[PDB]
């Protein structure tokens with residue numbers, strides 16, 4: 001109940017400090033990417049616990065948010081890394097792959113990376129977007145208790161704080177009020193496409209995923 | 222359409238609104254799995270024709286090439302149906318108003334296997350809109366955004382980047398949404414917060430759409446050709 005008292009700058013600083021490291025691929029291709037994703041997942045948990053307001057929530061709810069968001073988070077991280085490598089996805093510094101190397105998903109990832117490039121997405125805006133995804137992707141599916149409804153409001157209030165943060169970053173960058181609301185919209189609409197990609201990828205898997213207990217156990221430590 | 226005032230944008234959108242259709246009459250009740258699917262499938266099909274008329278009247282849409290218009294529709298058609306359903310169902314807590322003569326609750330959708338999830342998700346969204354007091358002029362803006370956004374990234378060449386115009390119009394709709402919020406007397410802070418809240422919901426509407434498609438291929442979606450033919454008129 002005090003991430004609600006943070007300012008835009010403190011919010012950013014906290015998020016920038018919580019950033020996971022860029023991990024390397026250990027050296028088929030599914031093995032390297034699965035292993036990479038697995039090691040990344042462990043850092044994602046500690047990153048989450050450092051997102052302002054996340055630990056204010058019950059364990060059950062923390063797990064659910066991650067359960068619904070973990071894939072979208074890996075994906076937006078990938079897209080951010082690959083921003084300055086047109087036509088290539090930088091899974092790891094030692095694992096840069098082009099188109100020809102689930103092509104649908106690969107193409108959508110490139111498309112999103114190009115979009116971030118065009119917009120000149122800033123690192124400070126990136127960490128904000130990643131936070132939004134965490135708090136948003138599972139908020140509409142929590143369920144009758146006063147506590148549950150107590151969580152929802154809290155999450156919504158934190159998301160408001162992040163919106164305030166994003167706007168502030170744009171004002172500081174010298175954007176007009178009109179340019180501010182426009183860029184906010186452009187950024188948030190991209191999240192819909194990231195959601196879409198996560199869903200597509202998720203059905204390819206069905207065609208051992210982080211289950212509910214796998215995460216709940218990992219959060220304990 | 223980049224010359225319209227926010228007021229003129231709202232008016233044009235409101236005028237484009239499709240009519241509410243009825244589920245075909247005197248179906249055998251209670252329902253069977255295949256009876257339900259038939260009624261809803263038939264409804265969606267008849268609604269698709271009107272959605273296209275609506276799209277043609279969305280400012281900026283006609284400026285695109287036929288091919289691009291079909292692509293946006295192929296991607297967004299289901300999301301557009303769903304946001305319409307959620308809007309209709311707003312003042313019916315715990316129920317979904319697929320049609321004025323077809324008001325179903327949680328347990329009347331248990332007919333189909335797995336579609337209960339989607340039912341719950343649709344109900345949750347409707348509650349959210351209700352809680353936010355989503356206004357009509359905001360709804361039409363959100364729907365237009367879905368149309369122009371859902372397929373904008375999954376379209377190179379010079380002519381192609383000029384079409385990606387779409388982002389200008391989306392900016393225009395954002396301006397309109399904000400203007401609507403300023404009129405109502407919201408503070409700047411409140412304005413950007415509400416704008417964010419609305420757009421984040423689109424992410425969830427996308428999700429519900431994807432779950433739908435998932436079960437569709439799990440049990441004859443509007444084809445490219447079909448959508449093109451109906452566009453030509």
Ligand SMILES: C=CCn1nc(-c2ccc(O)cc2O)c2cccc(C(F)(F)F)c21
Nearest residue numbers: 030033034036037040074075078102105106
């Ligand atoms: C282009 C998506 C493939 N991909 N990406 C990833 C992936 C891994 C880590 C990461 O940070 C981002 C990713 O997209 C991945 C992980 C396991 C398996 C797969 C594959 F689809 F190939 F089976 C993974």
Ligand SMILES: C=CCn1nc(-c2ccc(O)cc2O)c2cccc(C(F)(F)F)c21
Nearest residue numbers: 034037038074105201202204205208209210
């Ligand atoms: C479900 C999609 C494939 N996949 N699997 C995984 C995956 C990674 C680790 C793990 O322990 C289990 C997984 O299914 C994955 C991770 C990131 C990105 C992707 C994707 F391919 F979708 F882009 C991943």
Ligand SMILES: C=CCn1nc(-c2ccc(O)cc2O)c2cccc(C(F)(F)F)c21
Nearest residue numbers: 257258261262264265302303306336339340
């Ligand atoms: C959530 C109910 C399922 N549903 N909804 C719809 C649907 C139809 C029209 C509309 O405006 C909104 C809808 O959710 C639908 C259409 C065809 C088939 C189905 C079914 F799942 F049963 F197979 C449909």
Ligand SMILES: C=CCn1nc(-c2ccc(O)cc2O)c2cccc(C(F)(F)F)c21
Nearest residue numbers: 262265266302339433434436437441442443
């Ligand atoms: C039955 C699969 C899902 N579906 N299919 C359809 C659908 C509608 C018309 C048509 O010609 C074919 C369809 O699969 C549909 C329409 C509205 C809502 C839904 C959904 F269930 F996802 F909510 C629809």
